[PDB]
Design a protein around this ligand. Structure first.
Ligand SMILES: O=c1[nH]c(=O)c2[nH]c(=O)[nH]c2[nH]1
Length: 470
């Protein structure tokens, strides 16, 4: 049904909206929570806090979000066998609310505990929310446009990040006080997802293979498709089902010891190890700090910051015309190299900062090129690259190895960024430059074209490089 198209859009809204929000909520109250941290550690552990460990306390406070995602990757392979798909999607609503109330209690109490452990309960909502959804929301009415749903998931991450700056302004909600409500505003998107979940009927391919409930399924497909002809669409979903139970689900550890995936387990991880160490997550995270040191005038940082996430939204909608026309190889490999030079130009601005008054205005232009290069370049392409990278026997095991490196890497970039700032001062992005160009070199010589080609030449092209032939 056409009316369900926006309902399904809302069904994918709160899960994607919330994950992006947590990446940008750090941005506005960054000095305010640190001052509130100062009121902590003197109340019970009475002594002034050394600045060396003060940054450590904030660094673990921000990076713990990634760790909750990592256990969110591991929780699926236990809970998924007995809990249902909507039932698992029902659970994160409870985790989101429980996480929010701990955040709302942050100023009610006088401790730092609830912020750290409470954000762990936000981290698990960065898990199953972005581990259930992306390959399991794929129940839009047309089955041929599913490539759009790849980017539809990605665009709402932009708004989730974008609303963080909007709701963190010095006029709307981000003040010296009322900062718990900046965290406490996360309730209303959660309940909206909770409100739409009963409104969303069910998962049409779940009840067919698990519950054996074809009588209710045919009514479900009429709700999604909105058409009377249903027999052809219910027979095709069983067509692949017999193939699924014919094939053997290969375990996780058998990949890391198989010689035919010697340079394929290590190349899927570095395709997305260069997704979090690409640095953009650091941009979103610590944006208030980094713009301040680049010669920017004070009292306007949030006033210019909206462009950091603004073009993220604009580039995402503009990415629809790029994927089909260019493919998946040249923009992925060309995206990293395009911004490898821009880090150098960024570092030129950050080093000088004084020769002209437009140098700080040149610094911000460098940042906007990085986001424009990213969403248009490597965006959701690594998510869908890995889908066709392996075959269907190891694909459910693909995200087991891919998810774990995703969040440990996100934990790595979040934890070590502030230490690099205080140590390397203005050359802090040189390390970020080395890793990103490394992805350009590594992926150039290994990855062939993947657009519009079936697995046969994907394997045959790789078999040459691998001398695989087991
Ligand atoms: O569409 C996205 N934009 C980002 O900024 C981002 N950061 C991340 O880790 N995953 C994504 N996905």
């Amino acid at each position: 049904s056409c009316s369900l198209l926006v309902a399904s859009l809302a069904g994918a809204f709160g899960s994607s909206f919330l994950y992006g929000y947590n990446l940008s909520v750090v941005n506005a109250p960054t000095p305010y929570i640190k001052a509130f941290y100062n009121e902590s550690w003197e109340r019970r552990h009475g002594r002034p806090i050394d600045p060396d460990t003060l940054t450590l306390l904030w660094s673990v406070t921000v990076s713990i979000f990634a760790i909750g995602g990592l256990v969110g990757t591991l929780i699926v392979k236990m809970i998924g066998k007995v809990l249902g798909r909507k039932h698992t999607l029902l659970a994160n609503n409870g985790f989101a609310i429980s996480a929010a109330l701990l955040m709302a209690c942050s100023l009610q109490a006088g401790a730092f505990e609830m912020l750290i452990v409470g954000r762990f309960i936000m981290g698990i909502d960065g898990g199953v929310a972005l581990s259930v959804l992306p390959m399991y929301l794929s129940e839009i009415s047309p089955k041929e446009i599913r490539g759009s749903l790849g980017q539809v998931t990605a665009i709402f991450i932009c708004i989730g990040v974008f609303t963080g700056q909007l709701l963190g302004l010095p006029e709307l909600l981000g003040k010296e006080s009322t900062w718990p409500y900046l965290f406490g505003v996360i309730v209303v998107p959660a309940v909206v997802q909770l409100l739409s979940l009963p409104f969303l009927p069910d998962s049409p391919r779940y009840l067919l293979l698990e519950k054996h409930n074809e009588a209710r399924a045919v009514k479900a497909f009429q709700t999604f498709l909105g058409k009377a002809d249903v027999s052809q669409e219910v027979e095709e979903v069983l067509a692949e089902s017999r193939v699924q139970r014919s094939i053997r689900l290969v375990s996780v550890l058998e990949l890391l010891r198989a010689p035919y995936v010697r340079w394929q387990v290590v190349t899927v991880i570095v395709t997305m190890a260069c997704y979090q160490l690409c640095g953009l997550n650091a941009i979103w995270f610590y944006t208030n700090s980094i713009f301040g040191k680049a010669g920017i005038p004070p009292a306007k940082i949030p006033y210019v910051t909206l462009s950091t996430g603004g073009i993220e939204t604009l580039a995402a909608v503009f990415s629809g015309l790029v994927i089909e026309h260019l493919g998946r190889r040249p923009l992925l490999i060309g995206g990293f190299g395009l911004m490898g030079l821009f880090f150098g130009t960024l570092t030129i601005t950050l080093t000088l900062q004084d020769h002209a008054p437009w140098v700080p205005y040149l610094s911000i232009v460098g940042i906007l090129a990085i986001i424009a290069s990213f969403c248009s370049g490597p965006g959701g392409i690594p998510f869908i690259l890995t889908g066709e990278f392996f075959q269907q026997s190891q694909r459910p095991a693909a995200f087991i190895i891919a998810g774990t490196v995703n969040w440990l890497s996100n934990f790595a970039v979040g934890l070590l960024f502030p230490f690099i700032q205080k140590s390397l001062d203005t050359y802090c992005f040189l390390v970020f430059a080395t890793i990103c160009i490394t992805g350009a070199i590594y992926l150039y010589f290994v990855l062939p074209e993947t657009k519009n080609r079936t697995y046969a030449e994907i394997s045959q092209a790789f078999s040459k490089r691998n001398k695989a032939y087991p």
